Each structure stands twice: as C-alpha cells, then as structure tokens.
Amino acid sequence: MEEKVGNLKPNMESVNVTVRVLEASEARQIQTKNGVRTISEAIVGDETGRVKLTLWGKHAGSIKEGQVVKIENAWTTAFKGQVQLNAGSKTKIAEASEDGFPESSQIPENTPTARRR
DNA sequence: TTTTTT
C-alpha cells in the first residue's frame, strides 16, 4: 500500500512511501494565515527519485539523519510547479529496517512531476 | 493544532 517517489503525484490526501534521509534542518517557526506553527524541512528520497519532505509541528526537526524511515499517509502539494511531500497528523513516521535501502549517495534526484495537457 | 517557499 506504499508507492514510490517516481510514481507519486501532487494533490493527494494520502501518500505512503519508504525512503532514506538525505538531509535534515533544525525546527523553526513559520507565520501562516492561521497563526504560528513549528515546522522544518528535510530532504529524502529513494532509488526511484527524490522529493522534499516537510514536517509539521512536532515532526519538525524530530526526524533523524540518513536513516531508513517510512512515510505514511500525509499529502502532496505542488509548490512552484514541483510536487512536495509533508508530514502531519495522519502521518506516522518511524525507522524501518529492510534488505538495505539505497544510500543517499546512490539515491536519484529526479523531481516527480504530473503530466499536463 | 496540513500550512509551508521556491
């Protein structure tokens, strides 16, 4: 029930995927139209590409460094034309152990993008 | 306390 990065699409209220940490920034406060929240940004991806991860509130800076994680049902929002991934409440992040997920130095950087008419 | 920024 989990899709890959090279097969993900924006505007989805549900996105399940397994990837590795490519980067991680400390948690900072942002100013929205609904007030102030605490979020952070961390780069992840797998052998199918790469997608920017956006943690929300407690997930902010709560993640680890290049380690095997498992993204859950979150969502995707297209910023500036490029798809993006986030992690909030219905999303549960946790370390996952497999047969050895691809390293960050061997993880593609292909940016997923839906097809336009 | 799903909004973020290029």
Short mmCIF file of C-alpha atoms (C1' of nucleotides) in Angstrom, two decimals:
data_model
loop_
_atom_site.label_atom_id
_atom_site.label_comp_id
_atom_site.label_asym_id
_atom_site.label_seq_id
_atom_site.Cartn_x
_atom_site.Cartn_y
_atom_site.Cartn_z
CA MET A 1 0.00 0.00 0.00
CA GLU A 2 3.07 2.22 -0.38
CA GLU A 3 4.05 3.97 -3.61
CA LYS A 4 7.45 5.21 -4.80
CA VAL A 5 8.76 8.73 -5.36
CA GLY A 6 8.96 8.29 -9.12
CA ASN A 7 5.27 7.36 -9.11
CA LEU A 8 3.92 9.90 -6.62
CA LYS A 9 1.62 12.74 -7.64
CA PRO A 10 0.54 16.07 -6.05
CA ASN A 11 -2.90 16.94 -4.64
CA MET A 12 -3.16 13.60 -2.82
CA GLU A 13 -4.61 13.50 0.69
CA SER A 14 -2.86 10.16 1.16
CA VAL A 15 0.76 9.25 0.39
CA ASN A 16 2.53 6.15 1.71
CA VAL A 17 6.22 5.70 0.91
CA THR A 18 9.53 4.35 2.24
CA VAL A 19 12.73 6.37 1.79
CA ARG A 20 16.04 7.40 3.35
CA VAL A 21 17.07 10.72 4.88
CA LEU A 22 19.14 12.85 2.51
CA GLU A 23 19.14 15.98 4.66
CA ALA A 24 17.68 17.49 7.83
CA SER A 25 17.27 21.03 9.16
CA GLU A 26 16.52 22.23 12.69
CA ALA A 27 12.95 23.01 13.60
CA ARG A 28 11.87 26.65 13.12
CA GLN A 29 8.67 28.72 13.48
CA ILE A 30 6.74 29.95 10.46
CA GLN A 31 3.98 32.54 10.03
CA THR A 32 0.80 31.35 8.31
CA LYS A 33 -2.70 32.72 7.80
CA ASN A 34 -3.89 30.59 10.72
CA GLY A 35 -1.22 31.78 13.14
CA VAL A 36 2.22 30.45 14.04
CA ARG A 37 3.43 26.85 13.81
CA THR A 38 6.70 24.99 14.11
CA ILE A 39 7.91 23.19 11.07
CA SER A 40 11.07 22.10 9.36
CA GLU A 41 12.32 20.84 6.06
CA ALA A 42 14.30 17.67 5.37
CA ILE A 43 15.38 16.06 2.10
CA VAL A 44 14.51 12.40 1.49
CA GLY A 45 14.33 10.09 -1.40
CA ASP A 46 14.70 6.54 -2.69
CA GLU A 47 16.04 4.69 -5.73
CA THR A 48 13.02 5.99 -7.66
CA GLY A 49 13.88 9.67 -7.33
CA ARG A 50 13.81 12.42 -4.74
CA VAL A 51 11.22 14.59 -3.07
CA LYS A 52 11.47 17.40 -0.49
CA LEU A 53 9.92 16.48 2.90
CA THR A 54 8.12 18.99 5.11
CA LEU A 55 7.46 18.09 8.72
CA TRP A 56 4.69 19.79 10.67
CA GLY A 57 4.64 20.88 14.33
CA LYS A 58 6.18 18.05 16.41
CA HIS A 59 7.57 16.23 13.34
CA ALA A 60 9.66 19.34 12.72
CA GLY A 61 13.33 18.56 13.28
CA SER A 62 12.10 15.42 15.04
CA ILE A 63 13.41 13.17 12.26
CA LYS A 64 16.90 11.69 12.03
CA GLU A 65 19.73 11.86 9.50
CA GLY A 66 20.37 9.48 6.61
CA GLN A 67 18.49 6.56 8.13
CA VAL A 68 15.78 4.19 6.88
CA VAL A 69 12.36 5.69 7.57
CA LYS A 70 8.80 5.04 6.47
CA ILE A 71 6.49 7.86 5.40
CA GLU A 72 2.79 7.42 5.99
CA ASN A 73 -0.44 8.90 4.74
CA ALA A 74 0.27 12.59 4.55
CA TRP A 75 -0.22 14.62 1.39
CA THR A 76 1.41 16.33 -1.53
CA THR A 77 1.33 19.96 -2.50
CA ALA A 78 2.81 21.38 -5.70
CA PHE A 79 4.98 24.37 -4.89
CA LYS A 80 6.18 26.43 -7.87
CA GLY A 81 5.17 23.58 -10.18
CA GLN A 82 7.16 20.88 -8.38
CA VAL A 83 5.48 18.26 -6.21
CA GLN A 84 6.26 18.22 -2.48
CA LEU A 85 5.63 15.93 0.49
CA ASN A 86 4.79 16.74 4.11
CA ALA A 87 4.15 15.03 7.38
CA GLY A 88 1.39 15.90 9.79
CA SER A 89 -1.13 14.08 11.98
CA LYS A 90 -2.48 11.15 9.86
CA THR A 91 1.16 10.66 9.01
CA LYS A 92 3.24 8.43 11.27
CA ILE A 93 6.99 8.44 10.69
CA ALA A 94 9.27 5.71 12.02
CA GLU A 95 12.56 3.93 11.31
CA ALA A 96 12.19 0.90 9.04
CA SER A 97 14.63 -1.98 8.52
CA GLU A 98 14.79 -3.77 5.16
CA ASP A 99 17.33 -5.59 2.98
CA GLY A 100 19.37 -2.39 2.93
CA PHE A 101 17.73 0.69 1.44
CA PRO A 102 19.82 2.61 -1.17
CA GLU A 103 22.35 5.08 0.23
CA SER A 104 21.92 8.85 -0.07
CA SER A 105 24.95 8.92 -2.36
CA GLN A 106 23.21 6.42 -4.64
CA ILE A 107 19.71 7.90 -4.46
CA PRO A 108 18.47 9.64 -7.66
CA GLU A 109 17.42 13.30 -7.59
CA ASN A 110 14.66 13.07 -10.19
CA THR A 111 11.90 15.51 -9.24
CA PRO A 112 8.41 13.92 -9.68
CA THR A 113 6.02 15.88 -11.89
CA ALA A 114 2.49 15.07 -13.08
CA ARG A 115 1.55 15.20 -16.76
CA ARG A 116 -0.10 18.33 -18.18
CA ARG A 117 -2.49 18.65 -21.12
"C1'" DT B 1 -3.19 22.31 16.03
"C1'" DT B 2 -1.98 20.28 6.73
"C1'" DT B 3 0.14 25.42 6.27
"C1'" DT B 4 4.50 25.98 4.34
"C1'" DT B 5 8.70 28.74 -0.17
"C1'" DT B 6 10.98 28.29 -4.14
#
